[PDB]
Design a protein around this ligand. Structure first.
Ligand SMILES: [Cl-]
Ligand SMILES: [Cl-]
Ligand SMILES: [Cl-]
Ligand SMILES: [Cl-]
Ligand SMILES: [Cl-]
Ligand SMILES: [K+]
Ligand SMILES: [Mg+2]
Ligand SMILES: [Mg+2]
Ligand SMILES: [Mg+2]
Ligand SMILES: [Mg+2]
Ligand SMILES: [Mg+2]
Ligand SMILES: [Mg+2]
Ligand SMILES: [Mg+2]
Ligand SMILES: [Mg+2]
Ligand SMILES: [Mg+2]
Ligand SMILES: [Mg+2]
Ligand SMILES: [Mg+2]
Ligand SMILES: [Mg+2]
Ligand SMILES: [Mg+2]
Ligand SMILES: [Mg+2]
Ligand SMILES: [Mg+2]
Ligand SMILES: [Mg+2]
Ligand SMILES: [Mg+2]
Ligand SMILES: [Mg+2]
Ligand SMILES: [Mg+2]
Ligand SMILES: [Mg+2]
Ligand SMILES: [Mg+2]
Ligand SMILES: [Mg+2]
Ligand SMILES: [Mg+2]
Ligand SMILES: [Mg+2]
Ligand code: NA
Ligand code: NA
Ligand code: NA
Ligand code: NA
Ligand code: NA
Ligand code: NA
Ligand code: NA
Ligand code: NA
Ligand code: NA
Ligand code: NA
Ligand code: NA
Ligand code: NA
Ligand code: NA
Ligand code: NA
Ligand code: NA
Ligand code: NA
Ligand code: NA
Ligand code: NA
Ligand code: NA
Ligand code: NA
Ligand code: NA
Ligand code: NA
Ligand SMILES: [Sr+2]
Ligand SMILES: [Sr+2]
Ligand SMILES: [Sr+2]
Ligand SMILES: [Sr+2]
Ligand SMILES: [Sr+2]
Ligand SMILES: [Sr+2]
Ligand SMILES: [Sr+2]
Ligand SMILES: [Sr+2]
Ligand SMILES: [Sr+2]
Ligand SMILES: [Sr+2]
Ligand SMILES: [Sr+2]
Ligand SMILES: [Sr+2]
Ligand SMILES: [Sr+2]
Ligand SMILES: [Sr+2]
Ligand SMILES: [Sr+2]
Ligand SMILES: [Sr+2]
Ligand SMILES: [Sr+2]
Ligand SMILES: [Sr+2]
Ligand SMILES: [Sr+2]
Ligand SMILES: [Sr+2]
Ligand SMILES: [Sr+2]
Ligand SMILES: [Sr+2]
Ligand SMILES: [Sr+2]
Ligand SMILES: [Sr+2]
Ligand SMILES: [Sr+2]
Ligand SMILES: [Sr+2]
Ligand SMILES: [Sr+2]
Lengths: 186, 154, 95, 92, 160
RNA sequence: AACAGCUGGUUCCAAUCGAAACAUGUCGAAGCAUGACCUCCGCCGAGGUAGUCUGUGAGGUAGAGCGACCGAUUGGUCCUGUCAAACUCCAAACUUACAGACGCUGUUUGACGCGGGGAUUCCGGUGCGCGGGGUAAGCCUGUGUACCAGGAGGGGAACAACCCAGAGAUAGGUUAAGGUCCCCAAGUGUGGAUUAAGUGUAAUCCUCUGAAGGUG
RNA sequence: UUGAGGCGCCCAAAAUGAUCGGGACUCAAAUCCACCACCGAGACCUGUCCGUACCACUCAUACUGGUAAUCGAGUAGAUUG
RNA sequence: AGUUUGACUGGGGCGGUACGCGCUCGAAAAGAUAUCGAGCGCGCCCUAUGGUCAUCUCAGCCGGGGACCCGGCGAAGAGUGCAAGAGCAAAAGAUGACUUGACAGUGUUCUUCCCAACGAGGAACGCUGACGCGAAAGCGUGGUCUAGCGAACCAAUUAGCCUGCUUGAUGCGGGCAAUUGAUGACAGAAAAGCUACCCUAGGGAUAACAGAGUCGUCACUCGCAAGAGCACAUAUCGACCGAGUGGCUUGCUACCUCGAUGUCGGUUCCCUCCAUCCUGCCCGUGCAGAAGCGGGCAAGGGUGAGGUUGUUCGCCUAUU
RNA sequence: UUAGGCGGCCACAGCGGUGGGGUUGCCUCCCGUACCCAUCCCGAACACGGAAGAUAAGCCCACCAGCGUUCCAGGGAGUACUGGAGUGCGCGAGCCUCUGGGAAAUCCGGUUCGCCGCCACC
């Protein structure tokens, strides 16, 4: 920018979307990456592999296409995250993918976070992924219990639209139960 | 196709330059060879440019020299039309000369020594200390120029 | 030379042009080569580890197996055969 | 330089990490009954005594560390390469 | 010391003051003479002294020639005549002398010189058509004090 | 019959190949050892690479430039004056790794390579190109190359390394460098111009000087 | 009046006897631009022979025939008759 | 009494260490490359100034209330132990926390030593074991990279085992693996000088003297002509700077001679050079004359005697 | 790709500027602290929960060249420099010719306000 000698960062570094130092350490495993990403409203999980002209996504799952199996709840929470991971995980198994390493991008490794929920989901789908159980939220929270008990302090329905008043972690069970099922159109 | 004639001896010439002449089958002063005009050969002659005389000869001249100085791969045997006819893919010297000039074959392929051992230039040459443009005999020559030299070294 | 260390006279060859300064892209540090492949050797100023002796910059060897994540590349120093341990970060496929 | 009197490190005997105690190697006393001792007596006579007429060399500006690392559980010590150090004080 | 000792360019460029100490000061008093508040474009005539051979000119010579030239312009046009002259080269090359025989001979620092390539302008003066023959005379005296033969060339000027 | 790393000497013919005057270590620099390099023998069995072209790479010297770093370096009320072995926004020629192609070479002349026997050698020198030191040197110390050393014969008045030229014997011929007025083989050659100083009749050079400046 | 080029002149002093090798040379026997014909090596071409290497035949390294444009200098030194 | 008292070196000595290491340049854009080459460093320091993880972004400038607080600009000029060059910004830097991988064993490869053999040392990259941190990939075989280093014999030290002469017990020994202790002349001897009383082997491989090359020094000249010379550059004197000639001084170099080319000064006797002191012939003058000053041609002839000092040189005297 | 995720090349992509775009869609800003988690102090950030509002930021789409950068034509320049050769020139430092290569500054006019890969998606 200033002159001939000026040094402009790599594009994805300017955009502040790719931590290249973390990326290298990640790519060293030689395994595919389980890309866990978040949006204010959605959660995405991708199984990316290295390629000659750029990465290759062999399977993915977006919280949006979660409804395609019977999801009538919001898509920016724990139950949403876990399920999206499981879906992507299952699709991954179908593609022949057997193992991966969790890539959480610029998100923080906070215990019980959603990226770890995504990870737990993928692991349950049958994917072998280096993890640490006690960094994963305890079952109930993944189910969405923390949200139900929150709506208990009602007086005003947590959810605007009507999915339900006291919400349902039971819906979480139905959807998971539905995915672990062999049939299911992936 | 160019005609190469070494006009300057080996003493004091760079070794990589001397080795080049040897790869072009010339091992003595006044020895001539016929070389196709390729990028590969072009570099070689450019490297030897200062110890040689070269250029494209006329059909006739090549014929005179072939008759007078060509030799079998082995032996004394004169290389005349009959020889050419009973040993080569051609009917006479002219057919051979033409094919060489048109770069369709080589003296070797036809069972001939790759080298034409010429005689010193009758009447002397223009000197080996200057190029053609300066009045000398070194470097690239005119077709008429090469012809004069080759004919003189008949 | 006034000294005989490994980096003597390596000012130029081990320095980045200002614009190529800074951490290098990971892609080439993870590249995979097969035994028999011809590879050019050139140290990447920005990459500290996995280097070979500077004297060998410019060589084009032959991958002949590996040691850990680094590669074992065969070359000929003058007339002598040598095996060089080097990571992909400092290698490039020939052609 | 400073150095901890105790710390966790590999015990080549237990074959697992444990708390070791670091001590400077105290010189053991000679007996005067080693082969070299008898050779000195045997070979020293009238005139020069060859090697036995030589005297103690000099000193390097700095000496290397000379320590014993003792496993706090099995009690057995082991030795390590030393490193040049002008001074060495243990912390505690 | 004779110039024969330093006039040729037979040594590496030696100018790095970060590695050379005790360099004698320059004897050149001025590089811009005459009316330095005026421009060169404000004059019809521009004459330059051109060096015909590549050489090194010690600061002692620059000053002597610059002096004998400007000193003439002063005498003929006045201490404020309407003209301006410039010595465009500066003595960057540091000079040594080995003043023990050839043992540890690297010389001690003794001076500075300017490297001038053949065909370059050492001096360039600007004057009016009237004082054209005076500047030519100043240069004649100037080239009698520097090693090489020179050409007095009239650049901007055709009133002949 | 002391020992010496020091001086001197070491006796017949011929045929093939043919160096090193350098690197590492050394109480080592007038010496050795280990390598480089020379040579001899056995083994292996199909490629090899002194030249060039092209492709895929390596490089910051020449040059250049610095409102591109850096540090030097002018003046005026942006402009205006300069530089760099230990500066670089630039950047050759060129050198170099690997591969293919052409060339050359090898498969009875066995290359490339491997193993073993025997060395000599580790005072070098010169020309040219590039250097660094030095006022310089027929100086000192590098580097690449060809030569002398260890290279005849022709030329250069003579003359290790400048020019031609690398050479079995003998014989005929034609040239090379160089030369053609005589000495001295070949022209008192041709067309044209300049010079009046015997300038000059002197490639290169310790060797052949001739400068700044000046010349109706 | 002024610019450019060619050759020459001044600048130019050393020790036994001056020199371009010498003689000597001036529309040259000098210098520059061209050009013509010649002389001149052991180089190059060519006849015969010798050595060495290789090939064919052979017990032969004895003869005989063949190949060498791509063999023929050499100090120290290695190898062989 | 026996010996030692090193090497390098524009001869040797004195000085210095280019005697072991690292960096830039020299170095001629691959690699390699010398000099008593230019600039300059290392013989340690650090339990954190090592390791990991989390959080974070530095110099410097500006604006608001050279300490602190807020905002903006800001690819890197900060910082990173110490030379130099290089590396590094969601870090290799800073802060905080945790931790001891500065771990044991054993290798591959490169380097040391380009090519091309050679040890100690060093580095990169592995494996086995045991660990630290991290969610995990992963990172940690000390400090971002290149200096910070040492053989055999002997001793001490660490853990287990082998072994000592017919045999058993005890003592005390011998050994396998490794750590520490130094040789800096740093691929390791335990080590001062004089010789003119000297001696030998050799060297012109190397100095004194003469020659030779060079010419900085020395001698002489030329160009330009500031200046002064009451005015006047050029009667005369003549700075600066610039260009040369000589080979008389001095210095440099190490070509020639060390199985020998006799030293300084003087003397005697011969030849020569000219940059001329006199003599001849001239030009200028700040040339009235006389006596001078300066310059030109010119080497035929002349240029002498004495006092001090070995002196050359030089000082001094009377003649000329 | 009517706004997305992961990238490769790593300024042709930077700096700066103009215009346009979003009812249950996407990205955001945004709203909000019971929880997982968090600030050496702050739900600012990190983390979690969520849609009342908005297209003003970001982002995506279209475009501008003043600065920086890449490439191209002409000029500078076959200049500077240079590998091979020369009984060519110069007192000399050095230069020239033939042969094979061949810049840099700078001027001028164009180019460049990213290109490409995988996945997902009215
Ligand atoms: Cl995200
Ligand atoms: Cl290596
Ligand atoms: Cl200790
Ligand atoms: Cl020969
Ligand atoms: Cl005469
Ligand atoms: K002598
Ligand atoms: Mg034949
Ligand atoms: Mg003839
Ligand atoms: Mg001729
Ligand atoms: Mg360099
Ligand atoms: Mg014999
Ligand atoms: Mg014989
Ligand atoms: Mg330069
Ligand atoms: Mg000899
Ligand atoms: Mg005659
Ligand atoms: Mg004459
Ligand atoms: Mg004795
Ligand atoms: Mg000595
Ligand atoms: Mg190099
Ligand atoms: Mg000892
Ligand atoms: Mg001990
Ligand atoms: Mg030593
Ligand atoms: Mg050594
Ligand atoms: Mg004696
Ligand atoms: Mg001598
Ligand atoms: Mg005598
Ligand atoms: Mg006279
Ligand atoms: Mg006389
Ligand atoms: Mg808008
Ligand atoms: Mg000459
Ligand atoms: Na980089
Ligand atoms: Na005894
Ligand atoms: Na001295
Ligand atoms: Na002896
Ligand atoms: Na030698
Ligand atoms: Na030696
Ligand atoms: Na000796
Ligand atoms: Na081939
Ligand atoms: Na040059
Ligand atoms: Na020879
Ligand atoms: Na002769
Ligand atoms: Na004459
Ligand atoms: Na011999
Ligand atoms: Na000693
Ligand atoms: Na080693
Ligand atoms: Na002398
Ligand atoms: Na002189
Ligand atoms: Na005498
Ligand atoms: Na006289
Ligand atoms: Na006297
Ligand atoms: Na605090
Ligand atoms: Na917007
Ligand atoms: Sr005894
Ligand atoms: Sr005794
Ligand atoms: Sr000591
Ligand atoms: Sr020089
Ligand atoms: Sr002059
Ligand atoms: Sr080079
Ligand atoms: Sr005539
Ligand atoms: Sr004529
Ligand atoms: Sr001589
Ligand atoms: Sr000359
Ligand atoms: Sr002149
Ligand atoms: Sr012979
Ligand atoms: Sr022979
Ligand atoms: Sr031979
Ligand atoms: Sr003694
Ligand atoms: Sr001396
Ligand atoms: Sr490190
Ligand atoms: Sr016993
Ligand atoms: Sr004393
Ligand atoms: Sr005495
Ligand atoms: Sr005279
Ligand atoms: Sr007189
Ligand atoms: Sr004397
Ligand atoms: Sr005296
Ligand atoms: Sr908020
Ligand atoms: Sr001169
Ligand atoms: Sr071209």
């Amino acid at each position: 920018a200033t002159g001939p000698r000026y040094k402009v960062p790599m594009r994805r570094r300017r955009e502040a979307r790719t931590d290249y130092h973390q990326r290298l350490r990640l790519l060293k495993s030689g395994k595919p990456r389980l890309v866990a990403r978040k949006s204010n409203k959605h959660v995405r999980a991708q199984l990316v592999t290295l390629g000659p002209n750029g990465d290759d996504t062999l399977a993915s799952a977006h919280s949006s296409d979660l409804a395609e199996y019977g999801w009538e709840a919001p898509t920016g929470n724990m139950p949403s995250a876990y399920l999206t991971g499981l879906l992507a995980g299952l699709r991954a198994q179908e593609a022949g993918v057997e193992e991966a390493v969790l890539d959480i991008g610029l998100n923080s490794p906070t215990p019980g976070s959603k990226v770890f929920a995504i990870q737990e989901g993928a692991i349950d789908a049958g994917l072998d992924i280096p993890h640490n159980d006690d960094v994963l939220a305890d079952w109930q929270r993944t189910r969405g219990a923390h949200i139900a008990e929150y709506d208990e302090q009602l007086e005003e329905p947590l959810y605007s639209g009507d999915f339900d008043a006291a919400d349902l972690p039971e819906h979480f069970d139905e959807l998971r139960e539905t995915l672990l099922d062999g049939d299911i159109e992936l | 196709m160019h005609a190469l004639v070494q006009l300057r001896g080996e003493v004091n010439m760079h070794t990589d330059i001397q080795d080049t002449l040897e790869m072009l089958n010339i091992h003595h002063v006044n020895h001539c060879t016929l070389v196709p005009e390729t990028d590969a050969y072009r570099g070689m002659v450019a490297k030897v440019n200062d110890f040689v005389a070269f250029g494209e000869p006329s059909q006739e001249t090549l014929e005179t020299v072939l008759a007078t100085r060509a030799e079998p791969l082995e032996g004394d045997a004169d290389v005349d039309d009959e020889w050419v006819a009973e040993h080569t893919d051609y009917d006479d010297i002219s057919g051979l000369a033409f094919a060489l000039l048109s770069e369709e074959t080589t003296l070797r392929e036809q069972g001939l020594s790759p080298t034409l051992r010429l005689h010193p230039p009758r009447g002397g040459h223009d000197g080996v200390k200057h190029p053609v443009k300066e009045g000398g005999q070194l470097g690239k020559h005119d077709t008429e120029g090469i012809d004069d030299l080759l004919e003189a070294m008949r | 030379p006034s000294s005989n260390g490994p980096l003597e006279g390596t000012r130029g060859k081990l320095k980045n042009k200002p614009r190529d300064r800074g951490t290098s892209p990971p892609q080439r540090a993870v590249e995979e080569f097969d035994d028999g492949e011809k590879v050019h050797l050139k140290i990447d100023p920005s990459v500290p580890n996995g280097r070979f002796h500077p004297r060998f910059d410019g060589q084009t060897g032959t991958v002949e197996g590996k040691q850990g994540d680094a590669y074992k590349v065969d070359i000929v120093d003058g007339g002598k055969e040598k095996t060089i341990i080097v990571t992909a970060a400092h290698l490039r496929r020939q052609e | 330089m400073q150095m901890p009197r105790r710390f966790n490190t590999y015990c080549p005997h237990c074959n697992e990490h444990q708390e070791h105690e670091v001590e400077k190697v105290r010189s053991g006393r000679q007996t005067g009954m080693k082969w070299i001792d008898r050779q000195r007596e045997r070979n020293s006579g009238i005139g020069n005594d060859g090697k036995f007429s030589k005297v103690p060399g000099g000193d390097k500006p700095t000496k290397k560390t000379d320590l014993k690392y003792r496993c706090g559980e099995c009690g057995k010590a082991h030795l390590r390469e030393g490193w040049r150090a002008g001074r060495l004080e243990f912390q505690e | 010391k004779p110039a024969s000792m330093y006039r040729d360019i037979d040594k590496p460029a030696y100018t790095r003051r970060e590695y050379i100490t005790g360099i004698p000061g320059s004897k050149i008093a001025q590089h811009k003479m005459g009316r330095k508040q005026k421009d060169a474009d404000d004059y019809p005539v521009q004459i330059s002294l051109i060096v015909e051979e590549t050489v090194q000119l010690r600061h002692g010579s620059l000053e002597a020639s610059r002096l004998s030239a400007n000193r003439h312009l002063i005498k003929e046009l006045g201490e404020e005549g309407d003209y301006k002259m410039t010595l465009r080269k500066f003595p960057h090359q540091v000079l040594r002398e080995n003043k023990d025989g050839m043992r540890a001979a690297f010389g001690k620092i003794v001076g500075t010189a300017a490297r001038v390539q053949a065909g370059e302008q050492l001096f360039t003066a600007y004057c009016n058509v009237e004082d054209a023959e005076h500047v030519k005379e100043a240069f004649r005296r100037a080239y009698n004090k520097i090693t090489p033969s020179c050409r007095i060339k009239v650049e901007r000027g055709e009133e002949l």
